[PDB]
Amino acid sequence: LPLDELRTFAEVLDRVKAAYVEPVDDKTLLENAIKGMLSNLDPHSAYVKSVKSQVLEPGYAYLRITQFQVNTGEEVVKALNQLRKDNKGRLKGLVLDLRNNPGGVLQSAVEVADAFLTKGLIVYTKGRIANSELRFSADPADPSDKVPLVVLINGGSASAAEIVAGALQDQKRAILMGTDSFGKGSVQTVLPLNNDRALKLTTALYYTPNGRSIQAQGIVPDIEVGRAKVTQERERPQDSDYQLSQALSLLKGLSVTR
Amino acid sequence: LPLDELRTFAEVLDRVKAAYVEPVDDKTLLENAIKGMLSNLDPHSAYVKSVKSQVLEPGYAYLRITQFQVNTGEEVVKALNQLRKDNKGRLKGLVLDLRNNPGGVLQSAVEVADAFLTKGLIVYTKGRIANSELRFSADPADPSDKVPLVVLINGGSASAAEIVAGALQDQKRAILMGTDSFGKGSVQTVLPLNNDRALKLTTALYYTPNGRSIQAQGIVPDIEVGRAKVTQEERPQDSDYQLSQALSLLKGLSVTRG
Amino acid sequence: LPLDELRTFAEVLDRVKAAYVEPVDDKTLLENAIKGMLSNLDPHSAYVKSVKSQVLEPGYAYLRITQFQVNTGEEVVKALNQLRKDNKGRLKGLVLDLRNNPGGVLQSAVEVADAFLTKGLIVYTKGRIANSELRFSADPADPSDKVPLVVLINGGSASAAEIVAGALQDQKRAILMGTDSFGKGSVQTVLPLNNDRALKLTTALYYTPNGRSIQAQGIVPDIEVGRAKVTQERERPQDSDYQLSQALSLLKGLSVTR
Amino acid sequence: LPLDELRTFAEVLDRVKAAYVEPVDDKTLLENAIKGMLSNLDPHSAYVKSVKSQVLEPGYAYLRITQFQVNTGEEVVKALNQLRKDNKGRLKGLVLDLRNNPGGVLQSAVEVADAFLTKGLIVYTKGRIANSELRFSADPADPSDKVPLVVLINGGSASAAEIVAGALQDQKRAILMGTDSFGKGSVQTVLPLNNDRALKLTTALYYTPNGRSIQAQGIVPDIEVGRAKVTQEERPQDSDYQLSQALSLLKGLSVTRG
Amino acid sequence: LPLDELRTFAEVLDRVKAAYVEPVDDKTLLENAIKGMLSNLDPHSAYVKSVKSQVLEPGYAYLRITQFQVNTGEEVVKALNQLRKDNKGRLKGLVLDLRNNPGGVLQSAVEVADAFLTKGLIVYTKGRIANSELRFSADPADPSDKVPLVVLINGGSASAAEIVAGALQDQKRAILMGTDSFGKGSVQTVLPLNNDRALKLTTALYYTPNGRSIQAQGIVPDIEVGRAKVTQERERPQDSDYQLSQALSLLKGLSVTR
Amino acid sequence: LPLDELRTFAEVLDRVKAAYVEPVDDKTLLENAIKGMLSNLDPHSAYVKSVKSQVLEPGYAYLRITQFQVNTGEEVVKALNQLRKDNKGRLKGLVLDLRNNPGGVLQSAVEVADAFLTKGLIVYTKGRIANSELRFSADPADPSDKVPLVVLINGGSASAAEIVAGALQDQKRAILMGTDSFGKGSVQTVLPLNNDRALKLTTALYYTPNGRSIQAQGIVPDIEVGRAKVTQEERPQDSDYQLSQALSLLKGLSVTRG
């Protein structure tokens, strides 16, 4: 209780209680002060097939994560094996379509990351409260079989998807190409109050294995690729998708070099 | 200041000070509570020749209010008589162009309304502060000489212009034509505080003679006519759809009224 | 017999009888003189569903007179009652489509006028001969039930239709909108001659109740509306017909005002 | 003047003077009878270097008659010999462009025709006045040197030009190609009257050597070829369809004639 | 054996035999010298329905020779009689489409020429060897019945077709219109050598009846007609074919003149 | 000179001298035999700042060889160090633009190759003349500092440029990207003859370190990327498709190589 600043606050509240057009009691003024304190502090504060896979070309395959549901992990691994069986042999290249992904279940995101990682950190949450600081390490099993993969990120790629992309980039496991990411990397917990109502507050934020806050930076692709049309001067989706075609050609060139 | 609910607000503020990710001191939380109490209460709260006239057709004339300045009233009357001299006789119809009129001097607004009204109320403010409750009644002189007129109002006409239009409509003096209006009919007083800072608070709001709040209702035209451009296959009605509609309505009204 | 001017005429006729390329007797020269005297004097001198009605919108109906036949009168009244039954109630507005109407039976025109008029003059013929000066007065029965109506006139609106429109305008019963009218308001009677052939001559002309000659003035609409296209900047025929849509909107505004 | 039928005409004129709507005196009726007797009898009755030549191709030349002036004849002959000098030898074919030729001096027309004819009639007028009947016979000199020629005639070629074309066609001297002609082949003499006013009357009309009246028949080309523009994928045949057709016809005619 | 020039040749051959990158024996050098001597001397040296006829318009018919096969002659005569039977009477005009004709059997070409010629030379071959100088004269039978015909030649008209066109032009029997011809008018005979291989050499060239070498001049049409589009300013193939339409109109005009 | 086969060649030449249509003397036949022996044997036989560099992105640079002049080598090295100074550190990737490079000084070519190679062969010529067989081995200094580079080759890159590219490819030093090359890898020496005239003969041809003849094989890029223009919806990769592909390949290669 600062009391002096509380005196200033109560004086402003009394002036409003006296002058406003429609009469307002103390309770509604207090509630509006609370709601606006939260709105001014933090915007997030208050008071269906998941996975689709396809072998786009012989040796090169495409895996898209529409959303992060609970089944998503098992489904991505199922898709990995399915693509390996479709190519009738080991894969030369893979594309992770994580663009247009709002986010979803954090555990499902971490297991999707685990399908590509054999060791190291994946994501860790930092905040100032007893049970916020969390960490997630990769298990020594990757169903990807070390396949070279390029991850696609758009503006509409946030939360869980951003975590996956960041983990894949910091482990130097994937090539991120596309535009920048949303940058939504904060966790909201509902805290209880003595009065019979509770408040939702961002209590911590996500951090990639390197240590860069997802919320501030976002995820910057290693190669920036905006939408564009190519003009020659000399199913199959890449004929219509610019970013997918670019990722495919990059994987092709990488395979040829390697 | 009821301390008992102050307990609830302090408890909530302390819980927020404890849980948020990046630490914030008591001062910023109190200041944000103030700013949001005002913001959540009221969005407006914080902490060129005026008239141009023309006789469109023999018997039918057009009066435009670009803005509400002090001269406006005199000029409007100067225009009225002038149009009577232009037609060399009494007018069969008149069009009040109040579209694209943000507002202006309130006294000029009541003067413009009073040039058409011989009795009754024009506009009245209701509020809870000591010296806000005021009223405006028409004087028994109308330089309009009882001419039938159509008033045109669009979205970009607010405050004073809405006061004029509402007065003309509720007094059954004019027929309003066009789209709905802005609906800005509130007065903000700057109130001083013990500390060397002040708060802007709406202290009263305007009401049309019927009793309809301009701020909530707005002024709804009797005839809805959206903006359009006509192309034949100076004379502004030949190019302006809304003005042409009002002119033709006045002509037909005059013919029936024989 | 002027005889001196007859001498001049006969001298010219003899010169022509002598000089022309192909020989011509006195009779053909006389006949050509007659035919050209008539052509030079007056151009008119010498020597199928009628009615369609529809309720275009709830409360507002449209009645078109393609042509003036004998049945036309009964048909317009039949249509009036039919439109009243279609709306399941009294009508708010009516449109008389008299455009593209060459004319027709005068009595049918006067009865069509009688469906809207309860008293007063309708049309009167004036000429200089025993039985030309005629008058037509409205009977005290109007099946229109005083419905407000707008009449549409084009360039191709003449004779009977022009009479109807003029009567409706001079009685201040309808609003005439559109372009100007044809202006054909003369009656041709065949007169008998001593020789076994007869001549058709305009013997009189029509006059509206006010007294304006239909032949000279034509019918000027109270509102002039040429064909045009409207461009918004925000069956059902009026969506395609400009004049009909204008008449509909005028009737709508009149109903709202009234 | 046979008074017995003058009775009929006077009776008719008096009946007209009696019946017409607006009164007209005897003088205007008599004057209109005169004007219409002439108008109904005959529509024409009431009360720049001339030649340019060029050799289109080796052996084939083009002679254009813009208008029929006095110099035209001499110039045409001057052109003929000149073309012979241009080709350095006798011509294989010649094109007479008589299109867009209103007419002109009749003597120049018979001269132009005579430059191609060695015997026979050229044109003769028939009428009933004393000194109109004239004839024109060709002199036994043709500077054309018997060259085969095609004459081009369109609608805008009348009188003198038609006289030339008709003479050339009926004498089987030229092949006419194009559309039909105007057909204006009549001569108007101004005749004086006892009163100080005169009348224009056609006193005779032209006839081609066959005997066909130019005024009624016109001159119909042996080959119909409408106007057109050709675009390859100076030389006027490269741009003019009718001239190109005539040139190709002359070339083929020359080849067959070997 | 010049021997001195043979010494120069053998010295050059020895220099090449010594210096070239890949070793070459005397035989391959000799063979290359031979092949290049032939290539440098003369390019031609080394070391399915035929006829379609149709009556395009009443009186005017069209005969196209796609190629010169053995049956071609009988087929053209068969077509002549067929067209005569189709028109149910003698023909007014005929078009020989010889354009886009590489050539073919010389005897078939000469018989096709014989279908139009009653006497005179058709084509003769000139060269310097015992049995090269040949001549071909027309037999006194022409199934064409002297019908006037126009022959069409394009750039792709060579050898046999060029011979036919040239014969028809030099006899002044047909009108050749179109663009210039290919100009391929040489005969290649294979000559035997002591060694077990032989050489093909142009031994003579064709000449038209006039004496102009087909190989050098080509066949120049009497009327030049490139592809073009006509624009009026006023099955049936000529509506789509410019050259065919021109030939048709020329035949029409020729028939009218004759 | 083996006279026995000289018999065959003389016999053939005499038969040709006897059979050809227009007579040709022995001299022209011998001269043509010479010219064609050279022409049939070998088609080539008969009888501006060089380097421009730029750092495209932080860590990635671009070096263009317009032409191979004497300064080129020095300039290339001057450019290499300069780019190292521009990036203020070692480069992550480099692009060698050898497209549109006809060739130039061979020593400058081996210098340009030597700026990237520390050991091994660069290019060697094979022929049969005395002093053609030469070899070029790399010196143990590479100013490239082992930077990974992609070389771009199109069709319009020949000789020296192909030598550089082939050396870089066979030494597994660079990844070649683009279309195939011209393939002009032969050296022509002018040889003198006893008579005062000389012959141009290819005396040797180039070979890449692998042993592949540049003239026959050409240099085939490891990655095929045709020319195209990209349009976003200075920086040349933003406009050049092939350069952008090489840049993205280098970036991905650098990321994987961590």
Numbering used by the authors:
A (entry chain B), C (entry chain B), E (entry chain B): 41 to 87, 191 to 377, 411 to 434
B (entry chain A), D (entry chain A), F (entry chain A): 41 to 87, 191 to 376, 411 to 435
From the paper:
Pseudomonas aeruginosa CtpA is a carboxyl-terminal processing protease that partners with the outer membrane lipoprotein LbcA to degrade at least five cell wall-associated proteins, four of which are cell wall hydrolases. Instead, it requires the adaptor protein LbcA, the lipoprotein-binding partner of CtpA, for activity in vivo and in vitro.
The derivatized crystals diffracted to 3.3 Å, leading to successful structural solution. As expected, each CtpA protomer consists of an N-terminal dimerization region (NDR), a PDZ domain, a cap domain, a protease core domain, and a C-terminal dimerization region (CDR). The PDZ domain is in a position that blocks the narrow substrate peptide tunnel leading to Ser-302. Furthermore, the catalytic triad Ser-302–Lys-327–Gln-331 is well beyond hydrogen-bonding distance: Ser-302 and Lys-327 are 4.2 Å apart, and Lys-327 and Gln-331 are 9.1 Å apart. By superimposing the two proteases, we found that transition to the active form requires the CtpA cap domain to clamp down toward the catalytic site by 11 Å and also a large-scale movement of the associated PDZ domain by 12 Å. However, the six unhinged CDRs of three CtpA dimers interact to form the triangular trimer-of-dimer complex.
